Amino acid sequence: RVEYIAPWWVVWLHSVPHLGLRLQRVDSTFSPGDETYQESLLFLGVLAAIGLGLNLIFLTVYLVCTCCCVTWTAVVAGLLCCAAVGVGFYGNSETNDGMHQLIYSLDNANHTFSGMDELVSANTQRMKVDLEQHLARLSEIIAARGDYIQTLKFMQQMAGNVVSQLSGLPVWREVTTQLTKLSHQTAYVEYYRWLSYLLLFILDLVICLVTCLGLARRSKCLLASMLCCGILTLILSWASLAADAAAAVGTSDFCMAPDIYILNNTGSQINSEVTRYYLHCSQSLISPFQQSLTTFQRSLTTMQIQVGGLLQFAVPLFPTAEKDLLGIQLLLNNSEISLHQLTAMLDCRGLHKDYLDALTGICYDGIEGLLFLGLFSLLAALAFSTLTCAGPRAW
Amino acid sequence: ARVEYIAPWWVVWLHSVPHLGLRLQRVDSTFSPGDETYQESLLFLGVLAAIGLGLNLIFLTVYLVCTCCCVTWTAVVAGLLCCAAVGVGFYGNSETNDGMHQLIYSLDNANHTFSGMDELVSANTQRMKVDLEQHLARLSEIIAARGDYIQTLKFMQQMAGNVVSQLSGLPVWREVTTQLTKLSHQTAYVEYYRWLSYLLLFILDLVICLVTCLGLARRSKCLLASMLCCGILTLILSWASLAADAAAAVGTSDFCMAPDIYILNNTGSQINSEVTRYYLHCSQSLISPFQQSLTTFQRSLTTMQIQVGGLLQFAVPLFPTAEKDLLGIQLLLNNSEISLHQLTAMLDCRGLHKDYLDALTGICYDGIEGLLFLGLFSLLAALAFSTLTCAGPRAW
Ligand SMILES: *[C@@H]1O[C@H](CO)[C@@H](O[C@@H]2O[C@H](CO)[C@@H](O[C@@H]3O[C@H](CO)[C@@H](O)[C@H](O)[C@@H]3O)[C@H](O)[C@H]2NC(C)=O)[C@H](O)[C@H]1NC(C)=O
Ligand SMILES: *[C@@H]1O[C@H](CO)[C@@H](O[C@@H]2O[C@H](CO)[C@@H](O[C@@H]3O[C@H](CO)[C@@H](O)[C@H](O)[C@@H]3O)[C@H](O)[C@H]2NC(C)=O)[C@H](O)[C@H]1NC(C)=O
Ligand SMILES: *[C@@H]1O[C@H](CO)[C@@H](O[C@@H]2O[C@H](CO)[C@@H](O[C@@H]3O[C@H](CO)[C@@H](O)[C@H](O)[C@@H]3O)[C@H](O)[C@H]2NC(C)=O)[C@H](O)[C@H]1NC(C)=O
Ligand SMILES: [Ca+2]
Ligand SMILES: [Ca+2]
């Protein structure tokens, strides 16, 4: 039993000042689909574009100085490109693994909720068929014995009580129907993001290797187009840095205080106390369902005792009736078994473990991958800047 | 949803590789960590690695003597191969480190659940004992002028004895927890040292290559001679790394083919075979053998409550000062009752099976991939350093 605590790379990154456009201070509270927050992240993109423009201004200054008015730099550029590619590959793998763990946890939670709902529905149907079995049995088998009719009626009322107790439990249709869509969407987005960064890595490596191989054939016509591509790769790297910074700050925002956001998001389809119980599990919050399970088991035991007593006192009288009554016993047995499974799902240990696993997949692997991808972008930008600086010196 | 473990391609293919003793003998063994024959069979991979190292060195020295006794492209190729090798090795080391952490997490979770089960059983037994002593103290307070109350107390004592026996029917998890925690500590220690050693190897390779390049830029000083000398040292280190990676991958891949069989064979005395088969395999149609216990246990509790309920409805005018501890009885039962729910949550298979499917994904999906990528490291680093050593003495 452990509780999530935000690591250093989350709290420190959350400490980064948040600004809008006109030197305005905004609230560093996660709020997707907004305007004072969604546009707040665009400041990072503005800073990235400013840095890209400044870098190209300095490169143009160098070109003007070297036009109007060596192998060590190429070696440095190649080494920096290789280091950047390695760091980027590691970061991409880590941030893909984080989302894979997220999807796994969401699938597990969806399966548990579906199992709970199916068990409740099956128990309700079982009681509904118990009703008609009682009706058929008391139709004409028991006439003179008033006590037998009385105990059949008492069993029928107990069945009604069990039905009401089962209906007392919540319904998990909305949570499942949103978890499935969130899982599908995150898988889709993760696939495209991974493919895009893989293509970027391949393109960078190919360009650098072609540069190294073709610099030996004494500056053919490919050099000009290659140098032109050296600017599109730079703008791609800067855009990657902007995207990584925005995603990292968003994840830090929805990792500093995740339970507040989760509780605020869901307050209608399921109760607030249920959510607080599932998100916070300890031997102080006992259960909101303790009374319901207790009375369900009490009614089941009363039913079983009455059925046993009826069997012990009806073997000689109406021997052909047991064919129905024994079935009831089996039915109750099944119900009893289901109850155990139910108390294994209503316990919050499994769901809290799934929530902790999803949160670890978000805040411990996605953010590290984004940070390493930002380091990749910085190193690749530096290496390509060095390559473009050393290019025209040949001609 | 719920899934069953299936061996991936990199395990089924890696398991197929021949295992031949040390003298081309059919060792035909499945898995045996403590058996000397299996260790000798695994030593065949080390023998092959040493043979490969010797062949590579003899080929390199034959080439050297032929080209001596009778170009920056080679240096560039060596540097590029070294950088690619270092990157692949870092990724593989991180990946194989990220599996021995999930292993420890799963072991700790299972240990915590077993400890909770044992503590709950012990606490319930103690609660029944204090219930018995409370009945013993109370029986002297009320008198037998009513008669039925003494019979009710006798029935409560009998039910308490039945509850105690039912609790004693449940298994004990001391040996399992001790083995689990010792294995967790050992694997943490081993993986920490492995990671530290390989990180030091990466740093050494990078430093050697960079300072060798700088010395080459320094017109072949004695430093260059020192680097050509230690090229053989780092080559044999890389070959030993390949030996270790191949041996470990061959070793912990046969376990991944049938892990449940090995686990069940390891533990068959301290706990029953049915319990282990239930926890390892609980797919669709198992009865959860504890059920027949829990059910009757629950029954007894309810009976007790009903009795004490009556004892609170027909004893209000007969010595009300005696009702105080009676309310305590109810509280006692209440506590026991809620504990029972927790118990039926821990005895459920899916609580621990998901821990068995995580300690298995941390071995069969992350350790083996890391070992394979580290073997790729060893191959690439050996090739790069062989090229560097071949191109070295050309300057002299
Ligand atoms: C997440 O939970 C949702 C339910 O909230 C799942 O969606 C649907 O779940 C039902 C219930 O099992 C599936 O019905 C099944 O259809 C098969 C078709 O052959 C039938 O054989 C079964 O007896 C059952 O009736 C339904 O197919 C499923 N919908 C989809 C699109 O799969 C969902 O599967 C759960 N998992 C995920 C990853 O969303
Ligand atoms: C696996 O579970 C077992 C049982 O829960 C753990 O063993 C218990 O661990 C606790 C703390 O780790 C021990 O408490 C300590 O006791 C010493 C005195 O012996 C005291 O000086 C400390 O301040 C602390 O209270 C407890 O004694 C120990 N029980 C036994 C029977 O060894 C075990 O630590 C768990 N494994 C892991 C890796 O956590
Ligand atoms: C052991 O558990 C039982 C039930 O789980 C406790 O009985 C419940 O105790 C509460 C609070 O002590 C009482 O609620 C009362 O309900 C009546 C209606 O029956 C209402 O008029 C009162 O204003 C009050 O809310 C009541 O005794 C009982 N309630 C229910 C629904 O069962 C018992 O108290 C527990 N033992 C101890 C020592 O607390
Ligand atoms: Ca990882
Ligand atoms: Ca990984």
Numbering used by the authors:
A (entry chain B): 5 to 73, 89 to 414
B (entry chain A): 4 to 73, 89 to 414
Extract from the study:
Full-length Mus musculus TTYH2 was expressed in HEK293T cells with a cleavable C-terminal fusion to EGFP, extracted and purified in detergent, and reconstituted into lipid nanodiscs formed by the scaffold protein MSP1E3D1 and lipids in the presence of 1 mM Ca2+. We determined the cryo-EM structure of TTYH2 in the presence of Ca2+ to 3.3 Å resolution. The map enabled de novo modeling of 396 of 532 amino acids from each 59 kDa TTYH2 protomer chain with the majority of unmodeled residues within the unstructured C-terminal region (amino acids 415–532) and others within poorly resolved segments of the N-terminus and intracellular loops. In the presence of calcium, TTYH2 adopts a side-by-side homodimer (a “cis-dimer”) within a single nanodisc membrane. Association between TTYH2 protomers in the cis-dimer buries an interface of 1556 Å2 and involves residues in the transmembrane and EDs, primarily in TM2, TM5, EDH1, EDH3d, EDH4a, and EDH4b. A striking feature of the interface is the close juxtaposition of a surface formed by conserved negatively charged or electronegative residues from each protomer in the ED just above the membrane surface. This region includes residues from EDH1 (Y109, S112, E113, and E116) and EDH4b (D384 and E387) with Y109 and S112 underneath E113, E116, D384, and E387. The cryo-EM map contains strong density in the space between the charged residues bridging opposing protomers. Based on electrostatic and geometric features of this site, we speculate that these densities correspond to coordinated Ca2+ ions that would reduce repulsion otherwise expected to occur between the electronegative surfaces of each protomer. In TTYH2 cis-dimers, we observe horseshoe-shaped density within the pocket, although the density is not sufficiently featured at this resolution to unambiguously identify and model.
